[PDB]
Ligand binder design. Structure first.
Ligand code: NA
Ligand code: NA
Ligand code: NA
Ligand code: NA
Ligand code: NA
Ligand code: NA
Ligand code: NA
Ligand code: NA
Ligand code: NA
Lengths: 651, 650, 650
């Protein structure tokens, strides 16, 4: 059989494994789409005997399972009550009981190291308290700040974030922080004395982007600022002995292009070290895919002896595991042409459980030898699909751009192509721009290959995966060399793979990739069909309408509207609409507030004004993340409009 | 004793009079707001003994009453069924019965001359027929430029059908095909020919001529009377049926073109423009916030056929004129007022006029056409007009920077005493091809009642002053129009001692919002500004507004792919760095005439630059909120405007 | 502190224990009322380490838990889906999953001995199939005698089907046809045979024998094991599968027939009634208002197959005995208490008993089968029992008018110090073939708490005292049963000095409401009376009660077309002219056991004759209101009873 659009309904994404404290079993999450085309996620257990069994079952989403320090309770988050709350499932028998009842639910939580309580993140309006509980003429809205809406949740009310202690038995709640403008990552020390959390303590929170690590003495209730504006940080992790705190962070020297590095602080000594300051590699997961997108990645994990940290890193299309010792060495431990998107490390052994995806493998758990870098399959969560349907592999190649710069790309061949045949080529361009295509499972790409298209996808400069200079190169040069890198790849793929039909080329891409799709068709006539998605066409309006417009444009394109309007206009695809003579399908969602739908309307109207071939498809109620986590029926429709457009105009 | 915002809930708009065919009585409409803050409208009869009595009563809207040619039935439109439908009320006893049950309701109707049927306008999806009746996830695929309207939101592209409805049986029969768009329609006195305006262009959204089609009722054959020579509305057959009159123009000046009176003689295949040499716009261009949806009369032939009575807009007035076929034109109901409704007696030189003025909300008057003397027939705002003191609007003229004469009006706070001065608020109307004038304006009374002197003017671009004056703004946005307004502030300061020249505010909506934004970016004399349903960025406007694909070109001068720097130069956002006046930005979420992104861009740039500004966003409201939107929201908009000036001007 | 009406909301009823197969732990059920005054019930686990742990938690009812043969799964019934369905809970980790989705739910289930399937009982209309799933005018034509039930109103004639449900897939398969009725059922330990009790009579409503049918699970072939010899319940196969135990009788005394232990040997075609010569009623006849719907044990085989553990009702006690296949019957668990749930260890001489007594609501106990000594395992009412003073029930005996010995019990109000006297309330139990005794009774505590001495006795007609005593009421309603109760009142006054002989009240429900009505028409000794869900007219009862078409004949002695005057002579309404006791009449609108027309006739006749009476009608409740009905209505009913005695007794 061959991949169909409806196969996205069968996909199952295992993610987020965590060991029991005895290291003999692990809990993890399986996200699926059910018969009613709704998302569900449930907890599963990998057991010592190798059995993999489901432990939660309802028409809801369970997430973020963590074993208590004793191992007797699996804490987790679930939306089964109508909001996301913290529930408690016994590890040895019995159903889960609901622990928290916040009106606004729970975003995140940690266990206390003594297991008597958990620390949960909730949010409160100024008129609300932690005692307010979930309860499952007209007024204008007054806006007075720059950051007043988000793609994730629309109009904001400015609720403040609160970390609360929740007693494991009684459920009694007690605020630990004040009402914070924003709380990010948080973590309590192994001795239970200190709560570290990332906060926005700036006087103008919307326009200043440093983020401070704040330490809270639980007993004394006193807070000390560990960073005092030296950067921004995430994924905090205390060392086993409690004397060091690790964080992923950076100093914003290249704004959103800045490489994320491993920091280690010594709170008692007041000092910090950037362990990977001399390793030109971006820590974390920049990988672009449409499966596992919401999966909880692992931050840095200390080695049990406190000698260093296992970190994932994004290089050359791979997300792999490395060990950064405090003494200096940086060594690979789990390497290969794949996407490591979930990780649990054994409490004592040189062993790990890793969730790994590749172009021909949706995603599964593997036991990994930390010392020898080999793995053994634990799960086969997509067995029928992988046993029935042929997957196209993604073959990497490199090419030189117009200035000699080496670029990396990948090609997939239609698995129905017999020798001597040529397929039309679809170029996929990834968003960000500081993201990374690579060795992960991509249903859209499979669908295109199965529909008879060769698929090219590349990492033009501006991508992550190739170090600080490469990811930064696109800033201020939107539509310059980034655009040459992609067109060099088209030419390079044509010359390197004879199964490509040079006369039948298409291009598609979303967000930045949508900006670049629009840019392309206004600058070359080489393509017979183009599909732009969640795209940008006018940087001037983008700044004032996008939920991040008021800093993104400046950060990426180079300036604000009142600084250099004509530069913004010159880098706007709409400027080149007179040149556009390629049928252009414009896909956009009504509630996409990252790229406002006015971006799509402007381009569609100018093309229609000029008598050009174009069509605008508006997806209701969806946002920018539609293609990854939006309504599954609309994901099907989006894929069908893409494929039908190339079918009409490439075939 | 002085106007308040909540007084808008008290306002009653009497409108749309129509004589019974014997001339002895007349039916009209009264629109109001009930204690649930909801719009109702009901039918009323003026009965010659002088009595005015209510004839419909429920929690619904009755509209457009018309007596049958025999006078025994009053037809009207009502939404009481849940959609607007044609009902019939006996003229001498009994309640109304529903006549039409169309799934998509009725937009408009006319009586047949014999009274046995009525012609109704409905709309049908491609999958629908005239037989479908009213009855109580997939992406949207958009393939055309005109895919949404401020009035309806997203359009489904139903086509228009005119259907004959038998008066006794309600049986329906389609007369037209499924038209892309049907405007005015009228049936000839002999009942044989239906004339209607249609969009017969191959690219309907980008071509703005509209054709008069003549449809032989018996054969259904059609002839195109106009073949693209302009655009037309308000059809009216002569009494002998040999001539067809219409209001129209040839688009020579796009949206600024004067509307003129045309007469067609279908049998001779000739046409003539009867007001070609009269430099006055026919129709009603008046700006107000009361009587906004009141149906205007349309041209009325003299019984003998020697000419037509037409309303027309000039110098702040909407008056009634007689245009003789030979050329001469007389005012026949004139005065410093707004004639917003009209019926002419069947056999006499008498009329019923709905008339508003700055100190009179609006009432019906019996008018002798021989001399223009009036008798009041209604007093629909008696309580409010007896308790609340109204500020008059005093007209004046002044010269602009280049000498051109401009007309304006000043309002002084009624509670102001001899020596005292009040801060001035300048109001700027939208359009721009509209006309401030002598009409009741609740919002202007509220500003006066709040202790503000109120200046409002007709800068060039306004209607009311001839073809050159109304066209002058096109291609010169923020040029001489801005000068006219500033010259008005200066002249007002000079001429009127009660103005406190040290406290000036400015506010306006739509084009008036573009202009408020323009003003605070080009001068700092105002200590406060409120911009409403405004424009800040012409480049995004063209692509997002429901009419942006022609308005920017028609009015600013070009499309973004022709001259983007010219659009930018006239965009108020370009000048945001100069902006030092506290700017309250009012905008509605579902305004698609001026999309909310215009306000959002200006808000963000001002906040980025640390300037004083707030963004107030009205849910579910569209561009017409201040006139016909949710009354509670209308209250809130008025409060937000007055509060901003109170904060920064007092 | 002492008992209040609202304490019924705090009561928790532990019930229905079952051992895991390794005997180290037992699952049970706890029924409670939550803060919404709704009933909940959840699974709990007791383990041999002493821990008592709650295993389900949601806003619903879980019940009937049973470990699978290997003990890795706990099957149980839950209504959380909106219908009662079979759910599976992992025995050692993980949440429950729903196994069945019948549109009509599941009434009962058993495990396959090999653990791979379960057999569930569902019901189906004639147009339904087992494939129909839960999905969360017309005149009604009635053609049979049993056309409605107190439990479920008008019956739709759904037929019962036993279906095999695969554990893994949930794939279902009908095993039986559509049965007129299915009662007990059991799968033999080798998996080859399903035993179930069916109504196989040609006229099902009027013939009351019930057959044990044997069904070969492979072939679905069926055999009738009993062929009309009686009626049967509580089937249990011997460990080696050669014998089938049942609780049954041959109806020789109709509803008064003692229930006995039968043991069949299907292959030999033989049977023994092993308690035929033991004049004791097997099962639980106890009267109480707590634990009402708790699942009793049924007969349990000794692991070696040598005999059966049976509960029995005797002299106010529900106690445990052992019946050897070799003949002897010996006590096992004995005392002045109510054994209302029981599980016996799968291999050792130990049991888990749920035990109630007048001063203990109900808890679980480890019991030694060797000597009967017990250790407390739960304390589910600890706060309540720590805080409120319980009044004990002191038993006594007395002789009736003909010398027959009767057993009764008295309760002294806790707040009553030595020397002081209290008015007496006589409670009369229903049935009549039931048994007052040593069980917790919230209503009786509340009466004691409210300052009333409480007398409750077992007149002839009661169970607990042999075949002759329980049979004695039939054909003698209001005769010696009434004498027994009156003699109990005299005896209590004579023996218990704290009774104020001048202030006597009486109350009772169903049969005891008939008796209350009888009493007040035959004696004026009582100053207050409260009759509940009662009977006043045996003639109409026959035709309107859900069981009237046989109860009256069976109990009162004849049908209305046999001897109407006998029915009238025994109808309390016949004596209404004699009634001089203020009578509160309590009845529910949807009681179809005792229809509300019974209450209305007595009310009307008393009012016609000017007597003191009030009628209180409970909406939406049925006959079982006082035990399992709407908690708020249960409080209202207790409230009205106490208020009536407070008004006339104190
Ligand atoms: Na997989
Ligand atoms: Na209607
Ligand atoms: Na004038
Ligand atoms: Na344009
Ligand atoms: Na300014
Ligand atoms: Na108890
Ligand atoms: Na009874
Ligand atoms: Na008898
Ligand atoms: Na009842």
């Amino acid at each position: 059989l061959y991949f169909q659009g409806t196969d996205l309904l069968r996909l199952r994404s295992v993610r987020d494994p965590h060991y029991a404290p005895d290291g003999t079993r692990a809990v993890f999450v399986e996200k699926s789409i059910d018969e009613e085309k709704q998302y569900r996620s449930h907890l599963w257990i990998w057991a010592a005997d190798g059995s993999v069994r489901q432990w939660t079952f309802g028409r809801w989403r369970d997430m973020k399972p963590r074993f208590s320090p004793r191992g007797e309770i699996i804490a987790f988050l679930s939306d089964r009550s109508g909001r996301t709350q913290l529930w408690l499932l016994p590890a040895n028998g019995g159903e889960a009981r609901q622990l928290t009842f916040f009106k606004n639910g729970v975003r995140d939580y940690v266990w206390s190291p003594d297991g008597t309580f958990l620390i949960t993140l909730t949010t409160l309006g100024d008129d609300e308290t932690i005692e307010d509980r979930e309860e499952p003429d007209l007024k204008p809205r007054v806006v007075e700040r720059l950051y007043y809406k988000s793609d994730a949740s629309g109009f904001l009310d400015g609720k403040r974030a609160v970390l609360t202690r929740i007693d494991v038995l009684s459920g009694k709640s007690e605020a630990l922080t004040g009402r914070e403008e924003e709380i990010g990552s948080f973590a309590i020390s192994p001795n239970g004395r200190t709560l570290a959390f990332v906060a926005n303590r700036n006087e103008d929170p919307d326009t200043t982007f440093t983020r401070d690590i704040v330490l809270l003495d639980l007993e004394s209730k006193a807070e000390t600022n560990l960073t005092n504006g030296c950067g921004t940080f995430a994924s905090l992790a205390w060392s086993p002995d409690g004397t060091k705190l690790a964080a992923i962070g950076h100093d914003l020297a290249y704004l959103g292009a800045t490489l994320h590095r491993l920091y280690v602080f010594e709170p008692e000594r007041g000092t910090k070290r950037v362990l990977t300051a001399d390793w030109d590699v971006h820590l974390g997961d920049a990988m672009v895919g449409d499966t596992h997108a919401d999966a909880k990645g692992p931050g840095p994990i200390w080695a049990s002896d406190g000698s260093g940290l296992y970190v994932t890193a994004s290089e050359r299309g791979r997300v792999n595991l490395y060990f950064v010792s405090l003494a200096g060495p940086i060594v690979p431990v789990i390497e290969g042409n794949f996407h490591l998107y979930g990780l649990a490390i054994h409490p004592s052994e040189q062993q790990a459980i890793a969730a790994i995806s590749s172009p021909t493998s949706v995603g599964d758990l593997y036991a990994v030898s930390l010392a020898d870098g080999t793995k053994t399959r634990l799960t086969r969560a997509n067995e029928a699909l992988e046993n029935e349907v042929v997957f196209a592999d993604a073959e990497p190649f490199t090419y030189r751009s117009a200035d000699g710069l080496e670029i990396q790309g990948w090609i997939m061949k239609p698995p129905e192509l017999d020798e001597g045949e040529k397929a039309p080529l679809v170029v996929e361009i990834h968003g960000g721009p500081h993201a990374m295509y690579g060795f992960t499972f991509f249903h859209e790409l499979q669908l295109l290959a199965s529909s008879g298209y060769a698929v090219l996808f590349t990492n033009p400069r501006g991508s992550h995966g190739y170090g600080q200079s490469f990811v930064n190169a696109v800033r201020g040069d939107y539509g310059g060399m980034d655009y040459e890198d992609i067109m060099a790849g088209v030419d390079a793929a044509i010359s390197k793979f004879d199964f490509i039909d040079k006369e039948r080329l298409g291009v598609t891409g979303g967000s930045y990739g949508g900006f670049m799709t629009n840019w392309i068709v206004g600058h070359t006539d080489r393509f017979k069909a183009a599909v732009t998605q969640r795209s940008i066409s006018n940087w001037l309006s983008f700044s004032g309408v996008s939920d991040i417009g008021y800093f993104f444009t400046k950060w990426e394109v180079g300036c604000d509207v009142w600084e250099d309007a004509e530069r913004l206009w010159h880098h706007s695809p709409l400027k080149y609409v007179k040149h556009m003579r390629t049928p252009l399908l414009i896909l956009h969602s009504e509630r996409d507030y990252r790229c406002p739908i006015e971006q799509a309307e402007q381009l569609f109207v100018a093309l229609k004004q000029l008598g050009r071939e174009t069509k605008l498809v508006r997806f209701p109620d969806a946002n920018h993340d539609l293609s990854r986590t939006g309504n599954p029926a609309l994901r099907l429709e989006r894929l069908r409009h893409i494929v039908d457009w190339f079918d009409r105009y490439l075939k």
